[PDB]
Design a protein around this nucleic acid. Sequence first.
DNA 1: CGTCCTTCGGAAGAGATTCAGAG
DNA 2: CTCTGAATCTCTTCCAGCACACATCAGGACG
RNA 3: CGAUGUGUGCU
Lengths: 66, 1316, 552
Amino acid sequence: GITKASLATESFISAASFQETTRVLTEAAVAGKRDELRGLKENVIVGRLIPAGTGYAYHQDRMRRR
Amino acid sequence: VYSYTEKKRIRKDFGKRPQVLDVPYLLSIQLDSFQKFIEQDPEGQYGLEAAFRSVFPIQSYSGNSELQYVSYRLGEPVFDVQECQIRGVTYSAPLRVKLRLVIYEREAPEGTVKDIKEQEVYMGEIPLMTDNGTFVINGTERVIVSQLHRSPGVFFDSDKGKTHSSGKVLYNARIIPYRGSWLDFEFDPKDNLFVRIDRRRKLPATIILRALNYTTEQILDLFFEKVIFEIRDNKLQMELVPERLRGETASFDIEANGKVYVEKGRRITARHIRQLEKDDVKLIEVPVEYIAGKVVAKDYIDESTGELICAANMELSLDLLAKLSQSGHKRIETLFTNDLDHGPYISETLRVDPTNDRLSALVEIYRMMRPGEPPTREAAESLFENLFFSEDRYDLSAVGRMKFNRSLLREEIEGSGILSKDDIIDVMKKLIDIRNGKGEVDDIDHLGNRRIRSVGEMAENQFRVGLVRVERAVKERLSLGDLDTLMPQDMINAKPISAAVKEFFGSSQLSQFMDQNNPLSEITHKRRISALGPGGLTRERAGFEVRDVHPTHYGRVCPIETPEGPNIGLINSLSVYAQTNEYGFLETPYRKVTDGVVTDEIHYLSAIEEGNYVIAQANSNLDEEGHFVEDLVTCRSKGESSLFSRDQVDYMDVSTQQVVSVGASLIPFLEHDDANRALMGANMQRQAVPTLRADKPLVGTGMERAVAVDSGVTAVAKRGGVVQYVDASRIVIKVNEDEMYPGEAGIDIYNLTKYTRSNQNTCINQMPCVSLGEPVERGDVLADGPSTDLGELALGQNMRVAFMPWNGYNFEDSILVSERVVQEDRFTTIHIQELACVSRDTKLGPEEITADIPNVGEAALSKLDESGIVYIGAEVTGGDILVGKVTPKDSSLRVPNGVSGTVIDVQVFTRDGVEKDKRALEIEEMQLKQAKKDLSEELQILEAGLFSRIRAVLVAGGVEAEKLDKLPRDRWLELGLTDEEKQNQLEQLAEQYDELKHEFEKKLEAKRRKITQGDDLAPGVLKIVKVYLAVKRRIQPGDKMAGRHGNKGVISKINPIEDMPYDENGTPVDIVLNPLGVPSRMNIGQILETHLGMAAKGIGDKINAMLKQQQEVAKLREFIQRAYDLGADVRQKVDLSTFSDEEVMRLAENLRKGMPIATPVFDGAKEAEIKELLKLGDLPTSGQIRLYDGRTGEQFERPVTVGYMYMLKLNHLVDDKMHARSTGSYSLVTQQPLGGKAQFGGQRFGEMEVWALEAYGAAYTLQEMLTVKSDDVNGRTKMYKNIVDGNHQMEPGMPESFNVLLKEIRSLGINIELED
Amino acid sequence: VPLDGGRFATSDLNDLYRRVINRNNRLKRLLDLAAPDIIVRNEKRMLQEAVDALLDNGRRGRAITGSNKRPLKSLADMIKGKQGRFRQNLLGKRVDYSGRSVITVGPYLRLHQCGLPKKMALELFKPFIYGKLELRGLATTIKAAKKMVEREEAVVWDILDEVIREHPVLLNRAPTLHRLGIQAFEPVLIEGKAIQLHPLVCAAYNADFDGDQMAVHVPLTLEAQLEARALMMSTNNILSPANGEPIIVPSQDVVLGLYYMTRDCVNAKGEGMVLTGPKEAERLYRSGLASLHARVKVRITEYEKDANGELVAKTSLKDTTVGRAILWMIVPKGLPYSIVNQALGKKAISKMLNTCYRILGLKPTVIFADQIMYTGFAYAARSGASVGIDDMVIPEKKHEIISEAEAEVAEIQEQFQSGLVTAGERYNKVIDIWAAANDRVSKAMMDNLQTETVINRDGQEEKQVSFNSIYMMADSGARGSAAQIRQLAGMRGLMAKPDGSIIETPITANFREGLNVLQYFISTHGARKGLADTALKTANSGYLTRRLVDVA
DNA sequence: CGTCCTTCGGAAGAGATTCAGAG
DNA sequence: CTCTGAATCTCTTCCAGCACACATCAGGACG
RNA sequence: CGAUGUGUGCU
Ligand SMILES: [Mg+2]
């Protein structure tokens, strides 16, 4: 369901933006979690570009530089 | 007969059903609550003395001491109302309470006291009221909102629906204590009862029946009846009533006296029941194993050994039958448990119970109340007696016990506040019966289940909180009672009392602030009942039904007045003719109806007795004695609207307008339009802003007079007199001799209210309206207040209106605007911004006041005085330095941004002990001489009245008028005159003269002191000087205006005369509205307003024609008589013959601009009456007259309805709504722009538009917004460098708030970090 | 920070630290002086409670206050809540270079452009004009330029015209449901404090002109201006994103003038006379020598792009109305005449614009719909079609069918006396007969308001469709409906009960005349029900769309 | 003054407990 | 039996956005 | 140079 996929999410930061952030933090803390962040909102939050348009071509360039 | 003031401008009445009742006084609620609150009154209920009798006397710990009540008293407040409002104090009076102590001796329970002592001890102050009822806290007038809550007491509901999906309703008996803990009941789907206290756990009440020391047999005796089997000769025959046989199927062949009646397998009909009751046979032979299904009612111990054969709460079996049979217990008691009639609930509820005695019940209760303590005997006992048996901890009021007795169909209406066992048991019996299938649950939404509290009630509650605090403190300190030296203030502490009353009137949702933009808004801020507050529910957990209206509100609660949005149907206000029960309910008038005659009385009715009767509607065509022309009529049975017979009814609706409130009352044409826009227009009329120049509406309703009277905005003449002297600031009225006092002469001297500041920064002001030398009336207005037009209440204005499109300037709510209106200046608002300037003592010394202002412009210095303050009368611009307050090294008082004004007033408040400078002392002496001249002229005109009474004495009794005036006024008493009550009246007035000497001296010296004395301030500040500005605002294209029809609008563009369409006379229209706004937003009554005002204005134009082009009283007499007769059934009842013919000149000047036309709510006019006025006018049938363009000059095809609309202006002025910020100051915790306008704040950029940007590919845009322009200081400094260089290049760096949150999680026990 | 005075603007976090360090120091002193174990046990339990309350109070069933009977805020509550970090700070951001006021129309403007207040332009672009004036040498420094623009001199407006020559702007509305609620525009400097807006954007903004506000945003860097003029430019924003709907649909007024325009009567000036060009019809109608709504024989010419974009000229002679030819000169080249050859309704002109974009491309479609809007407001103002008190024409058959349903409910009540009908039987019979009676009166007023005009043709008489104002305003489809005018002219409906079943007495009165207290009371109940439904509907839809943007 | 002190919901829903039902 | 799910229990949590204005901040108590 | 409530109002 629409709350299931929000919880079951690799982007733990987006789950932190979603409800029961405490449970997300406990699950990541016992996970030892490390995230290539895969998306939009967390990258807004960290203040890089969004891989969406022009930013998606820039992230094409960014993956091409590595 | 009518008023001589009403002879100035009469209103054309409309109304066809005659009235039997006028409008009563509207502000009775607050006055009665507060007056029953404070009064030296016996018998307790209700008010302060109830709380005193509850709290007093206060005795020792049998330590030979008792403090008893005597009385209380309050003197006057130390100050006035007005300078107190200027000052910032409550208008409160010294609570001086008479209290006597008695202290006994060693072995003196009844013996002699050793000491008595009594004093009238002070304890805080409580606020007195305005005669308009309200309170003022600290220069700020706030209003106590009375709170709707439920009824305290027992209630029976089911709470069906979403309970366990079993298709099974529940049942809950719910008791609401007036003061105490919650106590409700609850069942199972498995059909066993439980109980809780204050939303706690699910445990039965049979354990508390054990705690009330009842055996199982006693409990079954309580809640059940008996069925008797007996050990007998053979097969142990049953005692039987055939009513117990009802609704059953015959388990065996029902037989009696060897005769067969009902076969085995037959269901028992009532036929065979009445046949066997004709037979009347109890004892019938039963099979031995059928009784095994029965459950025994009592215990049966053995006879020989005394040992338990079998106990109660136990079904049977034949081995048990032999065991009791070999003992031979010839009585066997069981319960009639017919599973449809009587469910076996209580027996199995006892089967659940693990506890046995009263003591295990006590231990379980004492554990479940406070888990975490060891069980204790006496602590459990004290706990149980403190649950619902303590007068300290549990009570219901007289209303609570009365509604409790109402629930039980009793006779005695009164009782205690603590419970009895009988109470609880009978409530349980009723609950069992509701479980069985008899009885009906009731909604909360019935108004009799609800109750509005009063101001005196909740004030008494807070007062009781203070009382129980201070008596705990006293009984503490009476254990510390030191003999022979304690006085009745040595244990006092009014600081809980003062803290409680200040926290109440300072911090309460119900104590909220008055809306000063409208007399009507002030009175509906008074007339307001909420569903919130202490004991109120929460809006986020309230359903529809508690918000949606119930038919009990009919005639009691106005259905069309509520705020929308977050609080809908919860702030519902009172109607017009509704009143208040003694018991907190809504008594309401009804015209009593006999067999065929309406009794002319009213009678007040409860909510529940409305179901008893059937009420006739007001539009029922009686014939002159109540002779209604039908015998069937639309009425309601129990709010049950259908057609009913004539002999059925006994009551009638009093008014056709009693169903609504006063806000709806001024709104005409309601019967044609929808309540959405009607409620919105009522809201915006509450949102109205005062104008400059008052002018009456043309469509009145008659309600305007009593509302303008009851609103305190003006001077109602408390006596009837003759006008003596008029000024713009005060008016002297000479009292007529009939209402005149016998001694102590006096004349009516009333002071106006001039240009002064509202609570909403507008111009509250009073204006005179009468001539000098004029007969007036007791109980009549004397001068117009704010937005009041000649004894009437006139908020908005009316202008030349029509309906057509014009170039999209009536696009959705766009407003076409003529230049003529902004020429006529008739919507200019006047606003008052007040600022202060404090003088705090801070570090490195305080900050000064004078004009030593370095390194600034000399223009702002030259406006100042020598003392550092700009002079009064000074038109100032934005940013102008007002008071120089330099910093020890400048923080001078300055004009805010975007505002202009003119200096009008200085108020100075300086801490006591601080030297005032030359400006403060100078304006102090100015106001001193001002009030000095005030009191002197009061004394002198009272002196004029006094020696005029002396002259009136010497009209008789040896009159020597030439020998009167030669010697001065003093010895006019002792001239040639008898030794009678003439000369004794003169002696009374000479004692009054010496009294005026002494009184004037002491009042003048007290005023000298009160002006002279230093002002109490906060610690740290030294003086505070208040500043007053004259702000004028006319209009600008973009603000928000409307009318009385939910017709919101925005002025689009000021437009010249040469854009306005004009008639064949050439007269240009002012404002044109949308045709399309009419059909969709269904408010058709504005067209009726348009036609009616158009016809009335044409009448007034013909009046002004006959006025300007002059003409005698006869032709105008004919015209005005034909105007005021006007067709259908009227109650105008005036004639032109009884007039002075010069008031007709005055009333023609009143009619030269328009005609006052009264309009009932649901007895509104008809279209034939409109066409009658149009024919009486010079005006056509439809009124769609052709016009011609201001630009093209052609006839508009399909001509437009033109006319007037009494439009409304709002307090949405876009200068206080336009706000922009290129770059301002930043927040501290995150270096980010703030919000608001006072704080020069930026626009919040929410996330919905972030998602909108996500629908685009705004990569650079989003990045420069959220990083540079919000968070990073480096990015915004480099972007600043880019703009001052013209460069366009950014680097984000890092969001600081991201790092803030990351360090917050690092402050949590979290190894969260950032890798390479 | 201090408040105004020696007291300080507190933090309950500092109180938590204070309590924890107090409890710890007392505990360690108890550790120092050999206290027994129950005392230090309860001490440690209180310390554990204090530390856990610093962690998450409110997770515990009892939360404590410091004062005001309001429980303090722990660190988890510093994180979460709708005043939480992402909520209050990390996403919702109060941002400089922005400005909020109430907007207006200014109908003469264009869709690419927008009206803008001059003092707000002076406010929001200060460092730009600073840099430009010191670029031109007329500014000495930041201080001199700041004081000169604070003086609001004569020369700063010219440089402001230079710097707002082509710089785009964007505007936001707080109920930002979909992405077209913000678009890029061109500023027009306005003396005033309101913001003028092209009319065809308003339905996409879903915003009435009651006094709703919008705020603006300043595109600082050049790349953002490139993005907005590329992506968020309103000229690029022509369709629904949800489907292929033209989102530039005209709402109410221009389509009203056009529905007035391409009607004709049977009998007026120049009925069926012959012309060859709509210039001639314009010259007749501005002189008024001909009629507006009359059949006119003209010669017309169209173009057909059936080659590889090459438009084939052809002409013919039709008989048609006047304003169709008038707009047909406004009509660009490659179109058929059959598209404009009717009464040209709301959805008709909508799909007309749809086909116009699908065939003739973007820019002539844009400027043509613009000229449509201009001439529509022009002839709407020229027409002057009002609304009248006699527009609600009522048949005499109203009270007759009222008497019919009256007799029917009388007979069903007589059957309910002896019990021939039960409660539900009478219920169903009565609701059906009132429904049928109301539908009959609806048909009566329908025909009465739709085909009432019976006039000569130069002959004796002839019927045609009704020229009622409110009937044409509903028949445009702009505002109102047949059910809503049924509420106006006829009686309105059968109002439901508070439960969800119906009340046996319908609202047999109309909006044209007066109601009783009772029908008004019942429809008031229904109206309050609807308003509460709207409010809690918004409350549902918020958390709905929250999860909707939270799912994919 | 200054300073020192501690009682109105509806959803899942996620386990937790009991039950029935036996084999 | 002894686990087998099922039913049924008892504690989470969340619920549109914007603006205004106003009040109160530790105060209680004892040197 | 605030943070909380508290009501108010526009959608
Ligand atoms: Mg709006």
